Design a protein around this ligand. Structure first.
Ligand code: CDL
Ligand code: CDL
Ligand code: CDL
Ligand code: BCL
Ligand code: BCL
Ligand code: BPH
Ligand code: U10
Ligand code: LMT
Ligand code: LMT
Ligand code: FE
Lengths: 47, 276, 251, 46, 299, 47, 46, 47, 46, 46, 46, 47, 46, 48, 46
């Protein structure tokens, strides 16, 4: 058990999930840009 | 004569064989039956070495060499002037080492202490036996034992190592070297720590095991303690010797004689994770 | 010497090392002689002049202790020179035979040194070997078995007593002694941990050095919550005597 | 309930599971990336 | 029973350690207990005092390690796959022979030179740390002077012999298998290192340190039932344990040490291994260039 | 046994199962997509 | 869902998560850098 | 609880954010200057 | 009904068994990949 | 040493019942593996 | 967001943040200096 | 309040900013001189 | 601004800063001195 | 982190330290003037 | 500026300053003596 009660547990978890989601969405726009620069996943013969 | 405190301990009993016939001391040395046998074997061996040298070209101490039999004799007894002296010096040496370990056992029993020292010596005995008996037998001829010469057995080590490409790439050999270097490191650390506590800076009292624990912590990160250090030292030395013996068993009986230890490592470079 | 000469820097350096190393071996063998000297000449030897050896023992060395005290080695008072032993034969090198009871005499594997009759004080000027009832803050770490309660049994299978308390070393957290309430005389004796198999083979802790009744004869500590170095040697020596002299008729 | 958690404290029997899963995913991705067919970066050789 | 492991392990408070002289800083407060450490030895894993010299030593050492690793990654085109594949074969190689003792280009030994400089500074700072940690507790500095021998061998290998040869190219690379190959080619290039007498002496003292530490560990474990592991107390006030140890070795080979002089034997064997090693390395090339020829000239 | 009880492991194992199952389902979705990009397991004739 | 942090110390869990994420980002960036197509410094080869 | 107050955390956080932001603006000026010295992200054929 | 785990602490023995099982599965898979007939990636050679 | 007794007996009772199901899933795997490629050819070949 | 400092002591957090940022900057400068295009010292090759 | 007072904090910070600024000025002069000796940042075709 | 000293020890931060600055200065001087263009002692090679 | 006296040593220590540092710097400046008269550094982009 | 001597121990500051200065002087003298233009013993090469 960690030295944390229930209240800070949930509110910490809320901050965790929200910042996790902001990180995901900025990573997603990063991937959109990267794909516009160079698409990956070629066909069986190449690009 | 005796140490000023020794008389308490020079009691009768504790031998393995012979009863009280050999239960006595010669100066400092306890004799026992195995002491007589050890001196017998050592002296027969030294006299055979001297005779082999008398048959040889030189008396130069560095160039004296008792050579193993030719490979034509395989695992059989060779004539005395064509390698048999090597076999008999080997038998005398293994006898001397075994009776020395047994005499140490007798002394342990007489003093009432554990048998850690004969047990630890048995590891060096086992490494020697691997070198002169187990490995040449597995490889089929006594010609694979090393010659009893101060600088010819170094030539044997060199030729044996270079016959497998570069012997450094022998993995058990790398482990054995790591253990030896760590044993030397730990011996320096332990000796210096005890000498620091016993012989402190000027004007200081003799320090306690607590100071030793503190400084060992600050150096290695944690503490093993006064019994842990001696345990670790015994283990490091014994595992160094054991992995040396393994190293020698796997090169020639397992990896072919003209093999390559550097090339054996390609199994890692050729894994499908990264090979193609 | 010069490039063509037989003498060159490598072998000159090697001979310098050989000289230094002979000197160092002499120095080391000399340091080795700070205890146990002069030698005690045996039967048939003139005892007028001392026997020392070719590196003579050095001058006595003086260590400074914490409380301003001072200890000079060799510790000649620890020798116990004259003990209860008689030569098994008149010639030199003959072993000795215990005249009395080797458990009480302290001879052979049962010998001890005349150590100081005072406990080790460690660092805070308190005895380091103490019963757990006297070292608050420490606990047996139930990850391992608990010796207390288990009745201790001899080597011949006779129960010797009951384990009452575990004595531990402070600042080196380690169990050194088990206190044993002896069988039926209301007496507590120490038992060194290395001389005991505290594993609960069946239900108990077993000591194979002495037999069950011999636990009455273990040398008792004068205080109750501290043990002196002298009592430490006496107890470990009483238990070591059994390695050669007990053999409790287990044949 | 499963008492492998009782033998193995989840505080350590879950971080080791995760380091192992990560190692496995890395190994599989490396294998695929070393093949010529399943490479998705400079994909097909020859 | 024998003392290879502890049957019953007691556990108590964490020890802060001996108070220091008024010349240091407050140490860490980790002081955790590992069960297996206490199984083989003591259990506490702190608190590690890390002062100025320790922190700068770690900083310089990690600068050197970063340089080495980034060079091994660049030499493989930054591929982590190829880094894992070739790791033991990668190395930051020493400078090229054409540059002598100058500062070469970064990709031709400049990075090697900078990593070697920073590793040497790290090692000297760690030596200073050992010295201060000993003399801040009022102890002798025997551990520091044992460390100085390893440092002398390391300097001879990487600095002194390359100096006397006039070229950084003589020095080892920073890699596992490549530095093994350097060792091999060093023996091959300078005759045969088996005929270097100080190499023979260094091997004698390494084998002797292994032998001695087996002997000493086995001896202390054999008399641990009599309190033999408390070596300082057995030296200040000789007990029956050290008497039995001395008598074992005196009856075995005719001579024995004391509780303190055995550790002088240990210290000196372990120290003479790299001392004779460093001498034999400094002699190899500046003085003797073919060791087998020298051996033939003598024996 | 280590220093925990059944108080937590009664449903800690439950949430572990739910998370492990979410992992498995998203992984099989990933495998389906990968198969659509390129099938594996050819026949001895080739692909 | 949220009950995790009752078992994992955030002072340590978050540090391990950040070290792991930085290491993964470095690994992926280096893999791209080693390819000929996705190298954004010095661009393609040959 | 980090042995630290709550409004004190407000203060440290404000200073941390302003430092972080001045850092990022210096870095953005740096990257504009570096791109003007030498652009990256080439075309599939090269520069 | 067999009861004998009193010499090997089940945690250490079990973790070593699992790492062995994983290593073995890895070995077999890598051997199969190394063959030409049993290579489900990149298909059969030549 | 090791652990308690009833602990050991339940350790066996769970160890064997997991080992068995592991062999079961291994066997059901080898079946369709053989479906894909039959191993163990004859001296003739496949 | 300020609550990140309620469990991360700003001393350790900030010192390891500085160490990590400097390490990343060093790594990026080293990578650029290894390439021939972005080698601001010695210029491009050939 | 970990270690220092609040007036000593202001005084140390004042001296720190003055010294840091003097260091920065000296370094800027050094770099102007260094650029006058050797410009870095070549063109993509070299110097 | 000035409050960075209410939590950081000046005696510690200042000595670490000086060590860091000297190490960075040494590294930069060495890198410049290894290049042929910015060598100020036997300046240009070849 | 106060360590040592305050203006009982710090000011006189600073006085001695400054004058010693200054003597050192002056000797070094003369040394560098002499070294530049012996061998200038900082060559042109083509050498000396 | 004298206030620095309230922060730094003058003794250890002075020993560090001396060791540092001597090391820097040794480094610079070695660098100059290894080059050709500034080698004052035997002078330039060629
Ligand atoms: C190659 C052919 C063989 C050569 C052998 C060596 C030749 C030279 C020595 C010859 C000695 C002959 C003695 C005959 C008996 C004399 C009368 C007698 O017994 O009086 C009591 C007499 C003294 O009694 P004490 O006065 O009570 O003793 C206390 C001392 O006086 C004072 O106390 P301490 O503490 O100062 O000294 C105690 C201790 C001193 O310490 C030792 O004994 C150490 C012995 C080993 C030293 C290390 C050798 C390392 C060699 C390395 C070489 C490498 C070269 C190549 C490098 C590359 O013992 C002694 O006092 C000396 C005993 C004899 C030493 C030599 C033993 C054989 C060594 C073989 C090698 O006791 C003895 O002399 C012991 C007799 C038993 C040992 C001799 C037989 C050994 C057989 C070995 C066979 C295998 C060899 C290999
Ligand atoms: C040759 C043939 C003739 C001789 C044949 C016989 C040889 C053997 C004789 C018996 C030796 C007995 C013994 O070992 O006693 C140990 C014993 C140890 O102390 P203790 O009695 O147990 O208790 C002392 C207290 O606890 C207080 O302890 P503590 O806190 O003072 O610390 C004790 C510590 C130390 O005791 C000391 O006395 C040493 C410290 C002295 C104060 C500080 C001075 C620092 C000087 C630094 C110089 C650097 C290079 C050093 C080179 C040394 C060898 C030339 O003890 C030791 O370390 C044991 C002594 C052996 C030291 C081995 C050092 C190996 C260095 C490896 C290379 C390092 C390279 C540099 C690396 C730097 C770091 C990166 O006594 C001594 O150490 C005193 C003797 C010290 C000798 C110093 C050197 C004298 C010779 C100079 C050269 C002469 C020839 C060349 C002339 C110039 C030609 C151009
Ligand atoms: C044709 C010419 C004319 C012929 C004669 C004509 C007339 C005929 C009638 C009259 C003459 C015939 C009758 C003479 C009777 C003489 C009896 C007699 O002397 O009995 C002595 C004596 C009689 O018993 P005792 O009355 O109880 O003795 C009381 C004494 O006060 C002893 O009291 P302590 O116990 O206090 O003193 C013991 C001390 C006694 O010895 C000493 O005081 C010095 C011993 C060390 C000497 C170190 C070398 C110094 C010289 C180096 C030059 C080269 C050496 C040899 C090199 C050979 C290879 C080139 O020994 C030791 O401390 C132990 C030494 C341990 C050595 C360990 C290493 C050995 C092997 C090394 C190589 C491997 O017995 C012994 O001394 C036994 C031990 C004998 C061996 C000693 C060590 C040998 C070392 C060999 C060389 C090692 C280094 C190389
Ligand atoms: C172009 C090259 C020129 C040259 C140009 C310059 C220039 C420019 C300068 C010098 C300066 C110096 N030169 Mg010059 N110098 C040349 C040749 C030499 C030779 C020689 C043998 O040829 C020597 C001995 C010197 C020596 C010196 C010093 C007097 C001085 C370095 C100051 C210093 O070291 O601070 C060290 C200060 C200390 C206080 C260190 C104190 C000692 C400490 C305590 C040592 C610690 C312990 C130590 C590590 C123990 C060692 C033990 C070992 C194991 C043996 N030069 C050549 C001819 N030289 C500098 C100077 O004058 O500064 C004022 C300077 O600016
Ligand atoms: C083909 C190979 C050659 C050979 C070539 C060499 C060469 C070359 C050398 C040796 C050396 C030695 N050889 Mg050899 N050696 C051969 C055969 C043998 C055989 C044998 C059974 O045949 C044995 C037992 C040995 C044994 C030995 C040792 C006695 C000796 C090493 C001393 C030591 O402890 O170094 C261990 C100590 C160090 C290596 C220095 C300590 C390092 C520093 C202090 C620690 C820094 C750690 C750092 C901070 C960690 C981070 C760093 C970064 C990760 C990079 N060699 C054959 C003939 N051998 C060395 C020697 O001294 O001989 C004269 C040596 O230079
Ligand atoms: C008597 C000679 C033997 C000896 C002695 C010796 N070594 C010593 C000491 C002594 C007395 C110390 O006091 C000192 C110490 O702190 O020991 C715990 C040390 C030491 N000997 C060490 C290593 C070492 N000693 C070696 C050898 C030997 N040391 C000799 C055989 C070797 C070999 C054989 O190669 C190595 C690798 C360190 C553990 C330590 C010095 C630490 C140091 O200088 O740190 C500098 C800081 C850095 C470089 C930053 C990063 C630190 C980490 C990389 C540390 C990793 C340690 C270790 C796991 C490295 C192993 C090799 C790597 C390639 C994996
Ligand atoms: C057959 O023998 C062999 C072994 O096997 C028995 C070995 O294991 C090894 C392989 C072992 C290694 C290569 C380990 C050494 C590797 C490093 C210490 C380098 C670190 C790895 C990287 C370069 C990746 C970069 C990641 C960084 C810098 C951040 C850290 C990332 C994490 C915390 C992990 C998350 C990702 C080899 C070569 C081998 O030959
Ligand atoms: C009362 C005491 C009576 C003592 C009786 C003596 C018993 C005989 C002692 C065993 C001797 C065997 O002697 C030897 O044994 C080996 C081991 O197989 C034989 O066999 C060996 O043959 C050849 C060489 O000859 C080797 O290459 C081969 O690998 C090995 O099989 C040897 O050819 C034989 O010479
Ligand atoms: C830190 C450890 C101790 C400090 C360093 C110990 C050594 C200090 C003195 C070093 C003296 C310089 O030593 C001297 O070096 C020069 C060049 O470097 C060598 O000079 C020559 O070396 C070889 C000779 O074939 C060639 O590369 C070249 O012709 C020339 O450089 C000398 O042969 C050597 O004697
Ligand atoms: Fe010891």
């Amino acid at each position: 058990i960690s030295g944390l009660s229930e209240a800070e547990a949930k509110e910490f978890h809320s901050i965790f999930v929200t910042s996790f989601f902001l990180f995901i969405v900025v990573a997603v726009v990063a991937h959109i840009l990267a794909w516009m620069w160079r698409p990956w996943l070629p066909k069986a013969t190449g690009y | 004569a005796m140490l000023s405190f020794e008389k308490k301990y020079r009691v009768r009993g504790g031998t393995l064989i012979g009863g009280d016939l050999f239960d006595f001391w010669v100066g400092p040395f306890y004799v026992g039956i195995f002491g007589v046998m050890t001196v017998f074997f050592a002296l027969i061996g030294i006299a055979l070495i001297a005779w082999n040298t008398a048959l040889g070209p030189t008396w130069n101490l560095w160039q004296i060499s008792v050579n193993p039999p030719d490979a034509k004799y395989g695992l059989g007894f060779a004539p005395l002037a064509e390698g048999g002296i090597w076999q008999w010096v080997s038998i005398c040496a293994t006898g001397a080492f075994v009776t020395w370990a047994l005499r140490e056992v007798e002394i342990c029993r007489k003093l009432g202490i554990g048998f850690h020292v004969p047990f630890a010596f048995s590891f060096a005995i086992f490494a020697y036996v691997t070198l002169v008996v187990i490995r040449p037998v597995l490889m089929g001829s006594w010609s694979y034992g090393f010659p009893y010469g101060i600088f010819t057995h170094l030539d044997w080590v060199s030729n044996t190592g270079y016959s497998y490409g570069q012997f450094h790439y022998n993995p058990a050999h790398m482990i054995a070297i790591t253990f030896f270097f760590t044993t030397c490191l730990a011996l320096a650390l332990h000796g210096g720590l005890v000498l620091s506590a016993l012989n402190p800076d000027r004007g200081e009292p003799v320090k306690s095991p607590e100071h030793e624990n503190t400084v060992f912590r600050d150096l290695v990160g944690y503490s093993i303690g006064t019994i842990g250090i001696h345990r670790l030292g015994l283990f490091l030395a014994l595992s160094a010797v054991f992995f040396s013996a393994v190293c020698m068993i796997i090169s020639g009986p397992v990896l072919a004689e003209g093999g390559s230890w550097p090339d054996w490592w390609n199994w890692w470079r050729n894994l499908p994770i990264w090979n193609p | 010497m010069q490039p063509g000469a037989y003498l060159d820097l490598a072998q000159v350096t090697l001979y310098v090392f050989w000289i230094f190393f002979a000197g160092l071996l002499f120095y080391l063998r000399r340091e080795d002689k700070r205890e146990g000297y002069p030698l005690v000449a045996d039967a048939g030897s003139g005892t007028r002049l001392a026997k020392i050896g070719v590196p003579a023992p050095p001058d006595p060395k003086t260590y400074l202790l914490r409380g301003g005290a001072t200890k000079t080695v060799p510790s000649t008072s620890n020798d116990r020179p004259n003990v209860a032993l008689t030569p098994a034969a008149p010639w030199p090198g003959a072993p000795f035979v215990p005249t009395g009871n080797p458990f009480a005499d302290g001879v052979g594997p049962g010998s001890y040194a005349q150590r100081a009759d005072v406990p080790e004080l460690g660092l805070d000027n308190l005895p380091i070997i103490v019963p757990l009832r006297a070292a608050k803050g420490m606990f047996l770490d139930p990850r391992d078995p608990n010796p207390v309660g288990m009745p201790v049994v001899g080597c011949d299978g006779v129960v010797g007593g009951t384990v009452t308390e575990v004595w531990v070393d402070r600042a080196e957290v380690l169990a050194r002694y088990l206190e044993v309430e002896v069988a039926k005389s209301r007496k507590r004796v120490l038992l060194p941990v290395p001389f005991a198999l505290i594993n609960d083979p069946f239900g108990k802790v077993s000591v194979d050095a002495i037999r069950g009744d011999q636990f009455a004869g273990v040398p008792t500590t004068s205080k109750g919550d501290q043990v002196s170095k002298l009592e430490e040697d006496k107890i470990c020596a009483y238990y070591g005597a059994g390695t050669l002299y007990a053999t409790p008729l287990r044949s | 309930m499963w008492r492998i958690w009782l033998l193995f404290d989840p505080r350590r029997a879950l971080v080791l599971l995760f380091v192992f899963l990560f190692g496995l995913a890395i190994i599989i991705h490396f294998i695929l990336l070393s093949t010529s067919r399943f490479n998705w970066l400079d994909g097909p050789r020859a | 029973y024998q003392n290879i492991f502890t049957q019953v392990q007691v556990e108590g408070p964490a020890y802060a350690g001996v108070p220091l002289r008024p010349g240091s800083s407050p140490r860490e407060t980790q002081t955790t207990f590992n069960y297996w450490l206490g199984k083989i030895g003591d259990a506490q894993v702190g608190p590690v005092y890390l002062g100025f010299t320790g922190v700068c030593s770690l900083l310089c050492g990690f600068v050197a390690i970063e340089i080495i690793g980034l060079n091994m990654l660049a030499s493989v085109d930054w591929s982590p796959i190829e880094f894992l594949r070739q790791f033991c074969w990668l190395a930051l190689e020493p400078p090229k022979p054409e540059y002598g003792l100058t500062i070469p280009p970064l990709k031709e030994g400049g990075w090697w030179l900078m990593a070697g400089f920073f590793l040497t500074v790290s090692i000297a700072l760690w030596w200073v740390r050992t010295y201060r940690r000993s003399r801040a507790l009022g102890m002798g500095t025997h551990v520091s002077w044992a460390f100085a021998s390893a440092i002398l061998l390391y300097l001879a290998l990487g600095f002194i012999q390359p100096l006397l040869m006039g070229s950084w190219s003589e020095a080892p690379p920073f890699g596992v298998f490549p530095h093994l190959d350097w060792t091999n080619n060093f023996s091959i290039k300078y005759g045969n290192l088996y005929y270097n007498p100080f190499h023979c002496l260094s091997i004698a003292f390494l084998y002797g340190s292994a032998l001695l530490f087996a002997m000493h560990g086995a001896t202390i474990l054999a008399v641990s039932r009599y309190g033999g592991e408390r070596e300082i107390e057995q030296m200040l006030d000789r007990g029956t344990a050290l008497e039995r140890a001395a008598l074992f070795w005196r009856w075995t080979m005719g001579f024995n040490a004391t509780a303190e002089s055995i550790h002088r034997w240990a210290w000196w064997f372990a120290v003479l291994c790299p001392l004779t090693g460093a001498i034999g390395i400094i002699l190899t090339g500046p003085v003797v260039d073919n060791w087998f020829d020298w051996g033939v000239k003598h024996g």
